[PDB]
Amino acid sequence: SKTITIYLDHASLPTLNQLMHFTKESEDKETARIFGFSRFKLPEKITEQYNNIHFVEIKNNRPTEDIFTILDQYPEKLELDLHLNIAHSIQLFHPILQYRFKHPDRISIKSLNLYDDGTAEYVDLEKEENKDIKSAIKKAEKQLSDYLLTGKINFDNPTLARYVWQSQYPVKYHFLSTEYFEKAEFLQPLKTYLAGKYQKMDWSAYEKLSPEQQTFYLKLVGFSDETKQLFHTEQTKFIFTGTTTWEGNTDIREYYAKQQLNLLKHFTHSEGDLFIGDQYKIYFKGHPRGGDINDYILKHAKDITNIPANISFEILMMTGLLPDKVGGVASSLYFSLPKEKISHIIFTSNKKIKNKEDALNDPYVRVMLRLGMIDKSQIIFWDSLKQL
């Protein structure tokens, strides 16, 4: 065979993980890699060293048909090591299945490494609490069998079906929150089913890395000396974290931008409801997909040190540059933080949230309550804050 390592993600969290996997094999310049993100994401000085590296667009949660043309370039017997996100694994897999129908003997699936996309997986699991999980796993296993035979996507429980890959392939899951699987009693049958097949997305796996490997990795993820020097001061530090919306609508985007700026003021102004105190130097860590919402903050915010938005927050934890306090909109990043470092986590909702009972039905709120990352007395949605 040749091994083809296929990394189908572009989103911040799974890609951060997959880039570490790549870094661990980076001295091997010959092995074929396919990445589901732009060729311009990584430094060209690095990528041009790899003689069998390709970049494919992910669209509607599937690699495009370019993936067929790439694989057509490899006439040998191939074993595919797939790396993909859990929430979208079914869709991401579809073209690989389609291609394998054409080359069933020559192309085999050697392994899957499955990673949380983010919090979507958790908020989706929250909606399954009253379902019969034992039988959902069974039904999904049968329905995965049919998907592999027919290529057609049909799952009674698309959320639980994300977790049955082991019935067909060697698999390892990388979870944002292993604790969630321990603390959610309704998931005990899944926890049991998955025993020994998962690990936490840990980020100490960056210490396992050699010193030169660590340097390489920072280059891949866009972390430089200049970023490091943003943290040179001894002064205690507060990072305001931003968020985003999958929504081109200008009114929705300008809404986000203005709400976010206002939220920042409630943390940084002595008149604010969340005032953190004068001791802290203030930083901004914009959402990587935040776009013009990030510009708006940088345009209008006084007295703030920007941490470039493309730098994933967790890189701060790996490199030992975490601040003293962090606050902002609910994000996957908070799952990485020790509790004492959290100032306030703030929520958003399309429904007007009018009171505490409305709040407790929000699935994101439920996840964070289940994990004890917030308590019920303090739950804040950002539209409840006054314009400052």
Ligand X SMILES: Nc1ccn([C@@H]2O[C@H](COP(=O)(O)O)[C@@H](O)[C@H]2O)c(=O)n1
Phi and psi, residue 22, nearest 5°:
-60, -45
The gap from C-alpha 34 to its chain's centroid, in whole angstroms, comes to 19
The gap from C-alpha 332 to its chain's centroid, in whole angstroms, comes to 7
Binds ligand X by CB under 6 A, chosen from 314, 323, 337, 367 = 314
Residues 54-113 that bind ligand X (CB under 6 A): none
Quote the CA–CA distance of 237 and 325 in Å, as a whole number. Answer: 6
Quote the CA–CA distance of 219 and 204 in Å, as a whole number. Answer: 18
Binding footprint of ligand X, residue count (CB under 6 A): 18
| Residue 9 near residue 18, CB atoms below 8 Å | yes
10 Å CB burial of residue 197 (0-12, 13-18, 19+) is middle
Binds ligand X by CB under 6 A, chosen from 85, 241, 260, 343 = 241
CB atoms within 10 A of CB 149: 10
The gap from C-alpha 378 to its chain's centroid, in whole angstroms, comes to 26
Residues 251-310 that bind ligand X (CB under 6 A): 285-288
Considering the complex, state which of residue 70 and residue 218 has its C-beta at the smaller distance from ligand X. Answer: 218
Considering the complex, state which of residue 193 and residue 217 has its C-beta at the smaller distance from ligand X. Answer: 217
The region of 163-171, 196-204, 207-215, 328-336 touching ligand X under the rule CB under 6 A is 328-336
Residue of 216, 203, 207, 205 whose CA lies nearest to 27: 216
CB of 221 to ligand X, least distance (A): 10
The region of 104-112, 180-188, 311-319, 348-356 touching ligand X under the rule CB under 6 A is 311-319
Task: Rule CB under 6 A: say whether 12 interacts with ligand X.
Answer: yes
Specify the amino acid at residue 74: Y
Binds ligand X by CB under 6 A, chosen from 333, 365, 374, 379 = 333
Binds ligand X by CB under 6 A, chosen from 5, 17, 119, 166 = 119
Binds ligand X by CB under 6 A, chosen from 163, 173, 296, 313 = 313
Binds ligand X by CB under 6 A, chosen from 260, 331, 343, 348 = 331
Q: Which residues of 378-388 are buried (b: 16+ CB within 10 A; e: fewer)?
A: ebbbbeebeee
Task: Rule CB under 6 A: say whether 177 interacts with ligand X.
Answer: no
Considering the complex, state which of residue 89 and residue 331 has its C-beta at the smaller distance from ligand X. Answer: 331
Task: Give the residues lining the site for ligand X (CB under 6 A).
Answer: 12-13, 16, 118-119, 241-243, 285-288, 312-314, 331-333
